[PDB]
Design a protein around this ligand. Structure first.
Ligand SMILES: Nc1cc(-c2cccs2)n[nH]1
Ligand SMILES: Nc1cc(-c2cccs2)n[nH]1
Lengths: 217, 212
């Protein structure tokens, strides 16, 4: 059993976690996902979670005080605190395997132009903290990244069932709009099919992801 | 104006991003995001969307006859067909910028084992098709990837939504024994810029040496 807490100023945005694979994991009791409104830990009437940056620059920064109070309540020393950010360490399949073994993930979703760095620095004095990027593009907030991380991790947890690129796949009918399934796939020859598939995999990889094979671009 | 159509067997997945669109943008007709249940285009009483893979193996492959009908109805010659797949070309910020000026994106969400490759191959004879990955990890389905692509693209459309950035700070100046770096309070803005550049350099070396 795993616990995932998500902290966000847009809790309704995390509703998709109830769909598809994460939803099935929740229904099967293999994970408990709880979503928390960060504004619950404010004390002013405006419920302000952001302020202008020290040193200048555009936009706003999330205040450390509100985050600190929230994480104080939700986290323990055993918690793995996950903070999505474009400036993070890369989240990869290896990360997903690693986090699939964790008892408690807390995902802190940032908005505006980022979270005051002292939040992560303070948390690291009590627990493990991982600032991570899910890809080289910029989101509007950490919530979509949270959904990506949760799905990539949960599909690996024991009980939710259990390199190179996969090549093309096909199913019935064997001919469609004048396009035929590769004959080898219809031949029933396991060795020849395995060989064709291995080849298609390496060919797609050099075209789409040459970096995976140690080439430029 | 941009139109985005998403096709999925989990249409409820995309409802929060639809609701997040500012009313002013919709009213001005700058953006429209529509979601379609793939099962609308199934042929049988069981509403089948997938079938066993040719050549054997685990899992299921999504049916070309169903996807073919759905894309026939939804796409036009002007469409950029986006197909999230773990085996895709990398989706990056450059991609997001390119797609932000498109008139019509259609995103086909499928299971990770794939859509029959003839769907993309056939579509590519009539429109532009882009098979893309959003990172080096595997999801079970394309819906989360669709959410990421929609967000990254629409925040670059006006009025809708190198080195790493270094740390940011705001009030209070001291918190839990940690002070904001005094240089940021110095009023020496050339020095602040130099300090930030060094912070960015160090952070990039530590977290993303690949970028250097
Ligand atoms: N990889 C990545 C993370 C993010 C964000 C996290 C929080 C706000 S934006 N964008 N792209
Ligand atoms: N980067 C990436 C894409 C995916 C998908 C899985 C299923 C459809 S798209 N996983 N990882």
């Amino acid at each position: 059993s795993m616990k995932i807490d998500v902290v966000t100023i847009f809790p309704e945005y995390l509703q998709p976690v109830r769909q598809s694979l994460p939803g099935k994991a929740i229904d099967a009791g293999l994970v408990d996902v709880a979503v928390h409104d960060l504004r619950r830990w404010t004390h002013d009437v405006h419920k302000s979670v952001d302020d202008s940056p020290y040193g200048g620059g555009p936009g706003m920064v999330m205040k450390p005080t509100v985050w600190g109070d929230a994480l104080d309540e939700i986290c323990t020393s055993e918690t793995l605190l996950v903070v999505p950010t474009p400036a993070g360490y890369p989240f990869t399949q290896e990360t997903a395997w690693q986090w699939s073994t964790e008892d408690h993930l807390v995902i802190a979703c940032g908005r505006y132009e980022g979270i005051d760095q002292r939040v992560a620095d303070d948390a690291a004095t009590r627990m493990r903290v991982r600032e991570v990027s899910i890809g080289d593009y910029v989101l509007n907030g950490g919530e979509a990244a949270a959904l990506v991380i949760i799905e990539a991790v949960l599909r690996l947890v024991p009980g939710v069932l259990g390199s190179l690129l996969e090549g093309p796949s096909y199913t019935r009918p064997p001919s469609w709009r004048g396009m035929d399934v590769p004959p080898v796939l219809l031949s029933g020859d396991h060795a020849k099919i395995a060989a064709w598939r291995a080849e298609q995999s390496r060919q797609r990889t050099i075209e789409r992801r040459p970096d995976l094979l140690g080439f430029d671009s």
